[model samples]
Target: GPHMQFPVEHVQLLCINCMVAVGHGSDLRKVEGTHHVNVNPNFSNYYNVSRDPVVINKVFKDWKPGGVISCRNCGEVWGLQMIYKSVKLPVLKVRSMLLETPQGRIQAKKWSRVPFSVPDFDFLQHCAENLSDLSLD
Candidate 1:
């Protein structure tokens, strides 16, 4: 049921197989879609990064943003750093990370439905039906 909220009570965010808490569900912010945030509210300065990848990859130059934030000891890619304009802030990509809850593990989704489905009447379908009727008339 969509009535259930994520971060379920005792849930904690962590790297896969790693008991250490790299992040938390409270750290998540919804933007563009679920499990994502725009660059405006950067979390880069907040994290205690041990080391950034020497060769930080930049898929785009205009809005430079792409770095792997790895674990200090184990060298696990815990999260990724990205940037977007207008926001001009850092956004962490933590999909690969795990959400440990009492029930089980669950990956974040682009849009977690809030118990709402498509309405019985669709505007596009109505328009098409009207168009066909007009053609016949």
Candidate 2:
């Protein structure tokens, strides 16, 4: 019994431990990544990604993401902040969170199975402000 990634609309994602709204399904985009979702910058105000290491507990081993983001309310380890071609993106750990659909709630399994699809990151439209080239006048 299996169904491919079913895309749902207007979904709500929340922190499992903190039970706070982390993002909506609309905020997710099918970016060049796995295990996590590339969230929109619009939802970034609620989070802070620190340079500290994020070590998820599993099988007496350490698996860490690039940077660490935490639950806003509970301050629990959330996910990674990855940099793709100088554009920093929030990679919300799908397993560390929960989402709600019109049907019910679900433990985040995979980005493919996640109940939504979104546009890719718009790095082209969002011009990079890093103006390193300078002309002497």
Candidate 3:
């Protein structure tokens, strides 16, 4: 699936089962891959969450390495864990989390799966740009 585009300001990531806000959309960034999805380190850093260390699982095969991220309050699985090795920050693959949008809250897994027309891109120039400055922290 392609990376999703949403109104960042109006969205928040939540646990689909319990509807608890876990993270803000401003923290998200579309990690590049064949099955691309939104990710954010700030979610783990700022929210009260729990991660199971023993159950090592893959959300996107070898590309992402970590365990299940859960809600501290209700114990809902938000998504696969992601640790940004460079900064040692805890990031999470939010494909399974619920996205609180302007219209209504929707699960990221379902949202990303919704089919849409593919748009043109300039990969060469796009790769040359720096995205680090987009940090909300």
Look at candidate 2 and give me any clashing residue pairs: 8-115
Question: Which candidate gets the maximum lDDT versus the true structure?
Answer: 2
Tens-place lDDT per residue, model 2, 1-137, is 35534344546667767656677766666454444555656555656767655544542212224567766666666676656555556677666667666556776656655555656655555443334244324
**Could you estimate the TM-score for every candidate?**
0.44, 0.62, 0.52
Query: Candidate 3, after superposition: displacement of residue 61 in Å?
Result: 10
Models, CA RMSD each:
13.4, 6.8, 7.4
Enumerate clash totals for all models, in the order shown: 1, 1, 0
Worst 10 residues of 1 by lDDT: 114-123
Q: After superposition, how far is residue 81 of candidate 3 from its true place, in Å?
A: 1.8
Report the candidate with higher lDDT, 1 versus 3.
3
**Candidate 3's residue-wise lDDT over 19-72, tens digit each?**
667665554444343322334444554334344553553344334545555565
lDDT of 1 by residue, 26-110 (tens): 5344433422432212334334344454335435554454455554434555455554433323343445445676656655532
Question: Which stretches of candidate 3 lie above 4 Å from their native place?
Answer: 1-6, 34-42, 45-64, 88-95, 108-111, 114-137
The residue-level lDDT of candidate 3 at 69 comes to: 57
By summed lDDT, the worst window of 10 consecutive residues in model 3 runs over 114-123
List where candidate 1 sits over 4 angstroms from the true fold: 1-5, 34-63, 84-95, 107-137
Candidate 1 has which clashing residue pairs, if any?
39-89
